[PDB]
Design a protein around this ligand. Structure first.
Ligand SMILES: [Ir+4]
Ligand SMILES: [Ir+4]
Ligand SMILES: [Ir+4]
Ligand SMILES: [Ir+4]
Lengths: 122, 122, 122, 122
């Protein structure tokens, strides 16, 4: 699935996700959010199962973005956990955790949860 | 915090997390779970905010492990979203998402959620 | 929104959710899952904000189902946290947590996470 | 476990959770948060598995609080999904989802995730 994951992806919020899969299971690329305190590109890095079960199952994968680059620092980070589903309508369906730096007093409200779907089009 | 994150960490389940922080905000290392379908070490990769707010806030960070190495393939992946808290009792408090490859029929039950705390001792 | 929430709802998995809103903010009804270890109806109970912000915001709400009734006991429970969005395309968008009874050894893998969308049609 | 769940519980944040279990599997009571936009008591309602597996497994359960009462309205709701563990150190370990009413534009950032542990003491 190294081939199928590599490329440009778009989510329901209009975010852009550009990624390269390594044969060992590495994922490198950049992310650009369409929402929130973000601006231009951010590095992403991750892992994917480089030998998925041959039974029509998705390919598990994950990545992280620290929301710091040359333009802004949102003092936060998001990780995406999900699976790549290939074929004629190729999808990466994910749930994500966004954590932001907080004082220990405010740690209870430090983590947002949500879900994104990525397609090759739009 | 590049200095404080780098090193060996242990969580409440007895898992071992060895990590190196880059100055640009990179996190590389290996993970060894004490539970589940895992055996020996797995690559991890991630991002961390390399310039945290000076106000006593934690440092946001995240990483991913694809549960595939030379011994086993659990066809799954876990991402950790959380923050590093330094000082005399240094902690990485996280929530994690574990996704496993599934058929689209079973995608509703593909994702486990939980939380880990890492300390330098134990 | 007491009026708009009350009624029969359907989610993307084909599940059926029948609910009555009280004026005090109570939610009572029954749930029938289309997937998993479930069969016929299960009681649900919950709360909703009975005075939402007049600014075009959704109405926060939640409910719980213990997966035990006269036919089966899945020894689990699911809670839905989300918001009701009214108008011509009325939606309840939720994320859900499904916890199952486990031994303390297996507690790390006790909780599934996912998301459901409910509409009045389909 | 109807007996063991009923009573007053306290979490790591210093919140107070007073609950009555019905024999059918109902949970009614009040919640008082020690943090956030809350003040005095809020109704809670929920479900619990009223016949847990005899194998040393926890008892699955869940509840909801809409953050509206006579004093304040936070336009939000939280659901707790978890299990009751009895014995000499009785615990309700939960993960929780807090959703707040938002505009559809801001729905991506509407949901906080976290975890609470409740004990009978402190
Ligand atoms: Ir979806
Ligand atoms: Ir904790
Ligand atoms: Ir959705
Ligand atoms: Ir805990």
């Amino acid at each position: 699935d190294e081939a199928g994951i590599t490329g440009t992806w778009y989510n329901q919020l209009g975010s852009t996700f550009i990624v390269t899969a390594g044969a060992d299971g590495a994922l490198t690329g950049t992310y650009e959010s369409a929402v929130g305190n973000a601006e231009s590109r951010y590095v992403l890095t991750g892992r994917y199962d480089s030998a998925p079960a041959t039974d029509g199952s998705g390919t598990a994968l994950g990545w992280t973005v620290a929301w710091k680059n040359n333009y802004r620092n949102a003092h936060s980070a998001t990780t995406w956990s999900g699976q790549y589903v290939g074929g004629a309508e190729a999808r990466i369906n994910t749930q994500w955790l966004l954590t932001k730096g907080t004082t220990e007093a405010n740690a209870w409200k430090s983590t947002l949860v949500g879900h994104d779907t990525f397609t090759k089009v739009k």
